[PDB]
Design a protein around this ligand. Structure first.
Ligand SMILES: [Zn+2]
Lengths: 397, 49, 397, 397
């Protein structure tokens, strides 16, 4: 695993530094690495593929060393090295696709393919080169039990969920109370409603609350908070809880009163913010607890006072909502986000070669089903496959 | 080329041809100096020997 | 072109590695590159500028080599090198602005300025250094006909478009049917409507469809799909097709029934997703085909049943919409996106020096007009200018 | 300051390049740097912490050099170097937290902690290594008075603001005119309204305008402009100016007529765009001036003509809005954005160790209060603390 990154690092540098006309002292230490790759790899033989429609290929290495005697590199020296690099870079593609496609349930952090088990001998350890990427540095710190961290831009921490809750209801569905929400990606939009507009509430104030637990602990997040749910603002018809009938929701929107956002960790309040919108921070949390309340306005112009009567026909329903959005955070387990394409490389290999459903991952690599039940057996497999997908992205985009 | 003397230390890690290929700007002289620097054998087992 | 990147790479490293007090072995291989720049460049003379208000400057190189005899670098050695770097970094600015401003129609991939044509001789090829950036690596792989790829965050693949289509209409404009859409940046919001709410449709179901063709083929995209068009949710008045009269649109919103999203490539279905919202992938596609339908709810409470009568006056119009958004994808041609500023550097040079409209690019470098007719003659010019803008961004931000 | 970055650069490279089994020529120049760190640092003694709940620790350096005689590194050579790196990387954490927590008002660009004042002697200058990061390169260019630049993705340039303006009002609040806006993060949503729908305006056209001044000058921005404010599109009730009464706002939405966006610099028009939506550029500006107008439609179908009478009861109010959004720009002072987490590292240290409110920064490091009054005394402190937070992020995530 450490020597699979070390093969790809000095094939990336060999296509970049060994160019025509360059001075020899620029590449004097790469060629000592590239010659010492070849000496270790000669005489061995490998075999990749076999699962699904992934074809079986056999690999055999018998190459010669590079020359170490020029002052400026010429077109003979480049063209005799390109037909050696192009055989190794085809070998690393078929080892990385052989490993992203396999999985185990007992110990997923171990190598699973036949070729990567064979590269983990002490014979092949002399190919080891620097480990400077983000995923190979966190592969080594976490293997010694030291603290790691991945930096994300808009991480997919919330599974998709769109539902509601009725705290007061009747079969006519004309005097209701409760909340509605959408949790999707890295964004929460909750909105509380009350059809009577707190005409009989004590002190004309109705209290709402919405609690979102996370799956993993986030660290040093940057969060944007805005006092409107724009998705629950228009008239719509909504089905019932069991799909029997439908009910109508015609909102008018007040401002949210007495907003309190809390950031919990094992039930302890780490941060809190009271009527403070814009950008906020959250240093360590795993549970977000939103709290906001509706207050009936005590003074109303004649255009407003017609909307909220005392009797039963309520044609304009009051609505109070919020909107939260995580911009960037630092987690310790691997996730998906909006910047890098490591999830897209894993699913595209499995979909292309028609791979059967195994014992660990959901069918079709569904991210909503995978972050919902994000077991420690799935975490060790998901890190092992995102790290191999990161090695393949250096050579083959 | 009008340069000064070498002023060479006994026990230099580099031979006098090796600190000469980086000073001389002539292409035809210096790539001969580079050939003499990195010239060695090749160990090949021919017939078991 | 390859030697213009090689001038900027070792002037960036010369301001970073040649600092006061550093050990000599840290910079022992950079100085052999920097001295070998100077030997190649002496005796030559250049000329940049001349088009628009870009002034004409003459360049002449007569410099001395750097010393190779210290153990730790001192303030004499730094200050005698800064007054050599500051002349080269002024030369590279005026070659990069001379090339981003010119264009050709026959073969745009060739150099156009007078200075960059002169740097493409075999005399100047010994200045060549490593080619490790993203745009100079894809400049070399594509020059040998090998497969390339650029990674984008929210790529500007859709030209701006906001229009509608009426599948059923009359001059009174009170019983309508069709779709509305906004395609802008990397986001599609389509919404279908029906004023009668399928009271006379067969099985009370109305079918909608919206097909978006792309300009270039995208690969391994990460796409977010949400079941509401929030832009077509409020009451508005819309002009007619020929601008004669105006018509009114008062929506209420049902949920989209039987959603199918397809990802086509040469008419072949690569991927498909049926009633699956959240994050999805798309491995290879060039045409997105959205399909969704409106179904009249069979059971309605008395608050809902007043909205949809059988007769002609329809005061509340039914609406069903979707929302699609591309987070990150990998294309093969150059584009614009939301992360890097290579389009902004090209237009800012042309606007500053009052450059006349040439034969290839649209007036004012309008991106909506450039991605609409994205010919192969414009693709070769756009890659040649984004690559020069990437070289200038290393030295001068 | 320059030698604090140089300690962290060669401890990051020491954990990456000194691995088991690697060839000695790969690390032959790092060990000459790492041994020359140790010779300078021996015999000295330091002291960090003391403010808030940050504990006091004493540091003392007495270490031995590394061996320079192997051909391939073995597990003795790695394990004898890891127990030297782990003492230095604990020292740099407590110097970086000692400096992010302190501030001054006279000259904030000078070092404030006791340890960083002691590292600024000429004895410690031989530890200096390359300065290749973005923040340490802009630390050095700006220290000599040369032009710098930071590249941001969605920069937090606007403080949070949500308010309105009534150009025509009466205590009944039934015939109003004015604008509403939200300025938050990097997004402007302005919307102008008129209850009479220009029935008595000259030529039935009502003119609106909204001017947003910036705090710092932005350069080469990429801006998305869309012709709808989706936040001011639904019915809501709004309080009065002094919080006395509430007033009702029921919108219908026309399209914006005759849109002009201007980009000012010292009162001079740099760029202008007239009825051009989508993506636009802005090369140099510090003031955005939006201008748009409402026009009554001259031809109306019978469904539209009922909405806008001639008399006083106006139940459907006209609304015209815009939406602007900065995707990426280049500033010269430090800011916050959506990609990097340098603001989150500073506040998380101050919140964890219970640090009292000092003379410069707002209580709780409130970014809305800090960009509102962004004095040159706060700019020198904010750059000095974001640069230290960038050094700590290399070693400890
Ligand atoms: Zn982004």
């Amino acid at each position: 695993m450490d020597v699979l990154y070390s093969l790809s690092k000095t094939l990336k540098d060999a296509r970049d530094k060994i160019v025509e006309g360059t001075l020899y002292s620029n590449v004097s230490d790469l060629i000592q690495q590239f010659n010492q790759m070849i000496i270790t790899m000669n005489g061995n033989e490998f075999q990749t593929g076999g699962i699904g429609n992934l074809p079986i290929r056999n690999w055999n290495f018998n190459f010669g060393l590079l020359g170490t005697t020029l002052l400026n590199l010429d077109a003979n020296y480049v063209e005799t090295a390109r037909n050696t690099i192009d055989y190794f870079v085809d070998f690393v593609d078929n080892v990385c696709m052989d490993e992203m496609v396999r999985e185990s349930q007992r110990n997923g952090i171990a190598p699973q393919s036949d070729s990567l088990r064979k590269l983990s001998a002490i014979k092949f350890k002399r190919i080891n080169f620097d480990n400077s990427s983000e995923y190979i540095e966190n592969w080594n710190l976490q293997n010694r039990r030291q603290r790691t961290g991945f930096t994300f831009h808009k991480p997919n921490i919330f599974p998709y969920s769109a539902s509601f809750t009725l705290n007061r209801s009747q079969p006519a569905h004309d005097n209701l109370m409760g909340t509605m929400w959408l949790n999707a990606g890295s964004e929460i939009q909750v909105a509380g409603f009350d059809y009577s507009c707190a005409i009989n509430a004590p002190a004309n104030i109705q209290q709402f609350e919405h609690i979102v637990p996370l799956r993993r602990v986030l660290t040093t997040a940057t969060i944007t908070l805005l006092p409107d749910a724009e998705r629950f603002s228009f008239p719509r018809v909504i089905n019932s809880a069991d799909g029997a009938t439908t009910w109508f929701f015609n909102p008018v929107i007040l401002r949210p009163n007495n907003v309190e956002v809390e950031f919990l960790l094992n039930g302890q309040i780490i941060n809190t913010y009271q009527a403070r919108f814009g950008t906020i921070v959250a240093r360590n949390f795993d549970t977000i607890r939103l709290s906001f309340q509706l207050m009936r306005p005590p003074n109303m112009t004649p255009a407003v006072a017609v909307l909220f009567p005392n009797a039963q026909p309520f044609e304009h329903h009051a609505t109070v909502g919020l909107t939260l959005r995580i911009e960037s955070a630092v987690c310790e387990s691997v996730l998906a986000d909006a910047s890098e394409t490591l999830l897209a490389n894993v699913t595209s290999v499995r979909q292309e070669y028609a791979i059967p459903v195994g014992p660990v991952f959901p069918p079709g690599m569904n991210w909503t089903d995978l972050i919902t039940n994000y077991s420690p057996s799935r975490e060790d497999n998901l890190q092992r496959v995102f790290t191999v997908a990161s090695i393949r992205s250096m050579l083959i985009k | 080329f009008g340069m000064q003397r070498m002023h060479y230390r006994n026990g230099d890690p580099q031979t006098p041809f090796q600190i000469a290929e980086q000073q001389i700007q002539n292409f035809q002289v210096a790539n001969w100096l580079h050939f003499v620097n990195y010239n060695q054998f090749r160990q090949v087992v021919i017939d078991g020997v």
